[PDB]
């Protein structure tokens, strides 16, 4: 058992749903660290396709990263063992194909962390916004390009740098979901479609998944421009704003943002 | 002439026509190999603008790899001079561009053929499938990556991982298709188009299709990943998975894979 | 302040009009060289956002590139100094968003430039076609990869191919664009986009933006595949066909294009 | 303990001596699997060097690949998991410098062993031969790779198309070797340097270590390249030849080598 | 014109004696300022080649990276703007030949420094360490990067693994080197050779330095490969092996590593 | 026969003598034409090496590219198509080893040329040059990448940058050659060393060459650096420089550089 998810296994597929509902299935370690262990149980011949979910009427999918765990310290926000980078590679590498179901609100790492996954089916009334700028944080190289496979590159950065919700109609059109269906059809949908891919050839459909991860990440460049790149994100962590952006959040008002 | 191809030519414009309806146009060695010839034999610089069909009326464009030429045991399926390996880096390497005129169903391999094409134009009740996973066959990095440039991640997993059809409507919807029009418009509609790229400078179009081609392959990797991916798919072609999937094609029953 | 653009400043936006409305803003030197000091002028912390467009009420967004600039004795015409390829680079390396707001018909370089801006809000009258092949032009690489990243490869072919225009509505569903609004709708619609922009982080923004240029180009080749496409370029624009696309379009008549 | 190695610790430095003399230490399954197990039991934080070596007086360092478990039957014999893929991956990735401490004649997949790990100390009698061209071996592009960060191209192919011997002067002066001793000082030559380096910074060793690792790696090209490589040398071990090799070194007779 | 450097141009060769004595040449930021500032005012087309050496009769060349400035605690040591990392880019990037003349000892960053120019000659008497592991600090990408141009990978990993030094004859040997030369001589002959470089054509080798830039650079991995080695070398910044290999080079005693 | 060589077959190896004498075998249009013609001719499974050698008693082995055929300004000297860069690839690609035996000096291209080939075997008398920078022409990316594989950056550099001779005693200790011996014993240790080859598995021999031709070239970019160093070259092709060095070649005078 776990603390904060609930596994259901009925043939070959186990739906995973979140239990963190208390802090709006924020992404803390605590939360992480069950998905994962619970993702590992599961890593078994007899188990061929996961689904995650929140529960039937959630309002808010997830919060996305929990603020109060974000380093404000002079500390990398999202280094390569943060929870949220964790998650995203755990996913991407499990040799089983991974449903995101999305009823409600999804928020900033909980948006990656969907993007990551192979299929997104969502409710008509769940919505989606992508944070960093609100909070002054420099996402990180492989956050970013986990958010270009889907949509193209202006969609990509009207999400970014507007941080404004989009529905799940234009969420379709633009290419980030699968289907869309009214609330009430959400389960059955999804679970014909991944009792469905049991049937198919996992050791097929597994090395096709890791075939699929390695040509999306061969997107290759020198030591130089990661260095450089890497000396940007550090002056937007060491910045005003990005002291601003958290200290805004926790006093529950708008950040006033001012360039250093 | 051709055993297994029509070939027409309207000024600047060539239509290759399958005449393998006896097998509903597979890519067997024969048929491709004839298909090849007569691309060959239209690189001219009068030809400006190729068309790929099948016969009008036809129920099935193509029936995808000849199961029957599939090697059976330790032998790699997808290796560099198969026949579907072949045409597809033909088609891509050829310097005029190659329109795909679709009516009737599309499976597995002649999926990614069309794909690989430079423009698809499909008849409204034209469909379209992705069949390894049918099969327990260990699909190649080229031949995914060949899936990859119109539709985003999330549908192309859709595809590939539940091997289900898909209406010319979605394929036009998620961006695998140019057009979609009346079937009894097709070939007014598709030579049309031929005849006014054909007024165009065709050097200009050549360079820029092999721009095109060269960037589209620029996803680069070090040797240790392909040999890594190489072993993956040597153990998928080595299972008892893949000897049932082949098995029950031929004997016309519902694979039981058990994932090894 | 100059003489071939308006810049206006509204809290911290940026508006950069055109003013060549007597060549219909083709991409004459001497424009760029306005076009691009107006945008280094506004590199200040005080603006957090740019919008570029042209003239109310324009038939004509940009003719293109200034076919007269084109050099004709054997010489590449899309060199890195020239200054489509400066304007594209600088938009792209500006550490602000910048939004093509576009009313009136969209040619050639003038297309790749708003494709290389990061938001495109466009009139539902205004239409956008690809024109070298008109010309007998032997597009760049950078050039052609940077039409590549909204919508898919059949879709950018078919454009390039036929150099035919296309719709805002049909530009909006392929990826191209992010909205299209009525033309009486269009400068309040893309203020309130630039406004809301310009209330978040503007590092967190600024760093984003340049990891998804560097991911954008991180397609990689070696020298000898970069080499053969300079050859193959420097065949088209030595042809007899080059000449031919600039003397007929100079003549104002249709080219007679022959392969050579 | 071990059945096919020997393990002394002096302090902080490792020695891993072979144990398969009756068998000149050939690179079979069963000394491999042994030799990583000793490896992976020393991979421990009051450990931090290891030495390789063969029993002192041997003759014969290694005579590398094991004939008779070469498979000949139209399977890879330089797949991802063959034992010296395994061994040669597992030395570069251990977190301590691997010295190879070579006393007698050194061949074929044993040179490639010692090419992987991070020094090699020599007797001024060793020699040294790769050998694949004696049998037709298509050796593999890892493999290839790992003979390539010493010596130079021309060095390297004379020592690959003659399968000659070289001296350890030889090897010396082409920078194969850090250094050769007479073999009455070998073993305290290797002791004193590795004692040295055990009193250095491992964690700044490792990090090190995995940063050459990873440059040394970084010679990337597309999945065309790689699939047409792999291609080429399944026609080499589906060749005559091929065959000839394995027969003619079994049968200890001269191969008759005819190009298919 | 400058503190810490002194220049004397001849013809159109400039000398750049540094004038630093006070800490050995090492490289603190006064001294890198004003060694960069003497290189930038000498891009100037009547200058052709760059001479950097210490006073003559100098015991130590350069004592390496100031220790004094390196940040502890939990702080990136090599950042991008680093004077070390800033001198190196300078020195690689400057459209003119730079030779490292060098008499005395060289250490560290001061070793990586001349690695970085075009030509080393030296004095019989000079010798060179890597010293990194002595300080528990872990070194960057693109430094080690610069360290791996001319002599191979086992020479390499023993210089760094005991960060012992090197006498001129063995540089010379593993072709870290160009010349060695008696000390009474070191002038005569680099002048020589720079004086002859001055009448070659400037723009031809601009050029071709820069071509060998970019191909030094060329080694690319991707963004997952970079975040993963920049979280390894975060543990040993952060760990105490690192905050003993500073405070032990302060208090001018022994480090004590533990491999935490 | 041919017009610019002479063959003759000694058991399984070829030997092509150039017979250009009246231009010193400069690598002319014709004389590259027949010595392709002469390697395409040998491409036979009964041949299994070839030597490239000038004439016995030879003062010049070839005096490089032909200066005369180098364009006269504004055009790219080092294009795809020009033979040097034909005969380069075509030796590089050719599945048989290549050995170089050099009898008297080796300038410029001729220099690239041998060091494309496989192997080096020398005479004690031979001379070796680079020497683009007395002509002032930008050399090309491949060209430079050809010469980086045997000696280090900063030999490299020097020998391009001075231009100066190095004797062959040199060129063997930096790793350039394989062997050097006295003229009288050349041609019969050459043939030994191709007799020997010629004895072993030749579809092995091909593949591991072409592997170590695919992992020389994997030194990949994006298509902006590429594009950024071409406008550098025409720069250089562009120049006054580019013009007095071709022009003091023709006068037989000592060129004056001024860097524009
Ligand atoms: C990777 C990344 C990222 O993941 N950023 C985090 C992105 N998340 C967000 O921007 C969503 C933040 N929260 C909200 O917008 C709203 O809380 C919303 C999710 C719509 C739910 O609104 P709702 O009214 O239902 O509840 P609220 O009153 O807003 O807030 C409910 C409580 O949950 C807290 N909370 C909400 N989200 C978070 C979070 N992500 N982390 C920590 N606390 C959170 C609020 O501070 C309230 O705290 P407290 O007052 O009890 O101490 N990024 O780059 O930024
Ligand atoms: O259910 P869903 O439609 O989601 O997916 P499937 O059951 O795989 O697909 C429904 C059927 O359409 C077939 N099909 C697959 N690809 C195609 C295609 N390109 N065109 C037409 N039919 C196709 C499948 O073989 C199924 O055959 P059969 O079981 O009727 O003999
Ligand atoms: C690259 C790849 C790939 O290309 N795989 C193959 C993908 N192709 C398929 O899955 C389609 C297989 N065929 C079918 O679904 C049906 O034949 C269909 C195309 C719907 C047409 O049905 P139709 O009723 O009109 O004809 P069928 O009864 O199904 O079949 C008529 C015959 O054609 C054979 N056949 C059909 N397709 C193929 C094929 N691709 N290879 C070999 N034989 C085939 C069947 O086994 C039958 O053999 P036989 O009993 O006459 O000896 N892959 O990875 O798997
Ligand atoms: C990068 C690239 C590229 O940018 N190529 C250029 C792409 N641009 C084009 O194809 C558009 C060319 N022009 C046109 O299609 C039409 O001018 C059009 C934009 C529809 C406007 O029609 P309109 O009926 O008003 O014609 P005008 O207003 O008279 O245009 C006024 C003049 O502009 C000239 N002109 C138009 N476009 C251009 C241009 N791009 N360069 C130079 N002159 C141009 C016409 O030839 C007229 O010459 P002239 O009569 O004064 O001697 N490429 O690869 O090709
Ligand atoms: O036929 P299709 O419409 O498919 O393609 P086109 O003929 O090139 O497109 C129809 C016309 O639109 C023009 N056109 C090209 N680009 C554009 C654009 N961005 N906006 C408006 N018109 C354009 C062509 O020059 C044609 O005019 P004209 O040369 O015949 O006077
Ligand atoms: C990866 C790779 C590779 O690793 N190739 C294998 C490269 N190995 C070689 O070329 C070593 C060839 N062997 C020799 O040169 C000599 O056997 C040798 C290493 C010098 C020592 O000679 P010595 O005179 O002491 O002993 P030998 O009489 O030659 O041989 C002693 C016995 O060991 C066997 N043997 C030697 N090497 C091997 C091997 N690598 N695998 C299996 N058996 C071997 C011989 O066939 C004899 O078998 P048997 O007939 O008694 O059953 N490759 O690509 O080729
Ligand atoms: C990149 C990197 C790196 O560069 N590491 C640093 C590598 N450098 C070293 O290990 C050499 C450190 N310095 C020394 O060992 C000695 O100074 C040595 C070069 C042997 C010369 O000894 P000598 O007795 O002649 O001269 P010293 O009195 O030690 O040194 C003369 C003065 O320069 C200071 N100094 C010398 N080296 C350094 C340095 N690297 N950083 C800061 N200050 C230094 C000393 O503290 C003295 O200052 P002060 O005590 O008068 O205020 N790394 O990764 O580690
Ligand atoms: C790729 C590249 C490159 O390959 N450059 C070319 C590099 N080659 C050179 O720099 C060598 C140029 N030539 C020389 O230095 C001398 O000719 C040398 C090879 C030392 C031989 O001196 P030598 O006094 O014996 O004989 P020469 O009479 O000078 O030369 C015999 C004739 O062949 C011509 N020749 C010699 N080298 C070349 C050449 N590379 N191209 C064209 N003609 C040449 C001379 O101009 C003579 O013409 P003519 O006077 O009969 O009309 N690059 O970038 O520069
Ligand atoms: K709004
Ligand atoms: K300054
Ligand atoms: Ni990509
Ligand atoms: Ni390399």
Same mark, same amino acid.
């Given at each position: 058992?776990?603390?904060?998810?609930?596994?259901?296994?009925?043939? @070959? %597929?186990?739906? =995973?749903? /979140?239990?963190?509902?208390?802090?709006?299935?924020?992404?803390?370690? %605590? /939360?992480?660290?069950?998905?994962?262990?619970?993702?590992?149980?599961?890593?078994? *011949? #007899?188990?061929?396709?996961? !689904?995650?979910?929140?529960?039937?009427?959630? +309002?808010?999918?997830?919060?996305?990263?929990?603020?109060? #765990?974000?380093?404000?310290?002079?500390?990398?926000?999202?280094?390569?063992?943060?929870?949220?980078?964790?998650?995203?590679?755990?996913?991407?590498?499990?040799?089983?194909?991974?449903?995101?179901?999305?009823?409600?609100?999804?928020?900033?790492?909980?948006?990656?962390?969907?993007?990551?996954?192979?299929? !997104?089916?969502?409710?008509?009334?769940?919505?989606?916004?992508?944070?960093?700028?609100?909070?002054?944080?420099?996402?990180?190289?492989?956050? !970013?390009?986990?958010?270009?496979?889907?949509?193209?590159?202006?969609?990509?950065?009207?999400? =970014?740098?507007?941080?404004? *919700?989009?529905?799940?109609?234009?969420?379709?059109?633009?290419? !980030?979901?699968?289907?869309?269906?009214?609330?009430? #059809?959400?389960?059955?949908?999804?679970?014909?479609?991944?009792?469905?891919?049991?049937? +198919?050839?996992?050791?097929?459909?597994?090395?096709? @998944?890791? #075939?699929?991860?390695?040509?999306?990440?061969?997107?290759?460049?020198?030591?130089?421009?990661?260095?450089? =790149?890497?000396?940007?994100?550090?002056?937007?962590?060491?910045?005003?704003?990005?002291?601003?952006?958290?200290?805004?959040?926790?006093? @529950?008002? +708008?950040?006033? /943002?001012?360039?250093?």
């Amino acid at each position: 058992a776990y603390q904060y998810v609930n596994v259901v296994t009925i043939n @070959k %597929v186990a739906v =995973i749903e /979140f239990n963190y509902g208390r802090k709006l299935n924020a992404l803390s370690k %605590v /939360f992480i660290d069950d998905l994962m262990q619970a993702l590992s149980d599961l890593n078994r *011949p #007899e188990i061929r396709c996961i !689904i995650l979910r929140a529960p039937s009427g959630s +309002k808010v999918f997830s919060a996305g990263h929990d603020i109060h #765990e974000l380093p404000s310290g002079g500390r990398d926000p999202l280094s390569y063992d943060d929870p949220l980078r964790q998650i995203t590679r755990m996913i991407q590498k499990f040799p089983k194909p991974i449903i995101s179901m999305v009823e409600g609100s999804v928020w900033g790492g909980a948006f990656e962390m969907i993007m990551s996954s192979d299929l !997104i089916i969502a409710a008509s009334t769940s919505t989606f916004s992508m944070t960093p700028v609100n909070l002054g944080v420099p996402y990180n190289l492989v956050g !970013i390009h986990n958010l270009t496979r889907d949509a193209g590159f202006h969609i990509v950065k009207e999400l =970014i740098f507007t941080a404004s *919700p989009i529905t799940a109609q234009r969420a379709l059109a633009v290419g !980030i979901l699968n289907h869309v269906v009214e609330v009430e #059809e959400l389960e059955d949908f999804t679970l014909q479609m991944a009792h469905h891919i049991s049937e +198919k050839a996992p050791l097929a459909i597994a090395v096709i @998944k890791e #075939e699929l991860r390695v040509l999306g990440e061969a997107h290759t460049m020198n030591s130089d421009e990661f260095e450089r =790149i890497q000396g940007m994100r550090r002056a937007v962590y060491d910045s005003e704003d990005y002291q601003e952006g958290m200290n805004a959040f926790l006093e @529950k008002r +708008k950040p006033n /943002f001012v360039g250093h």
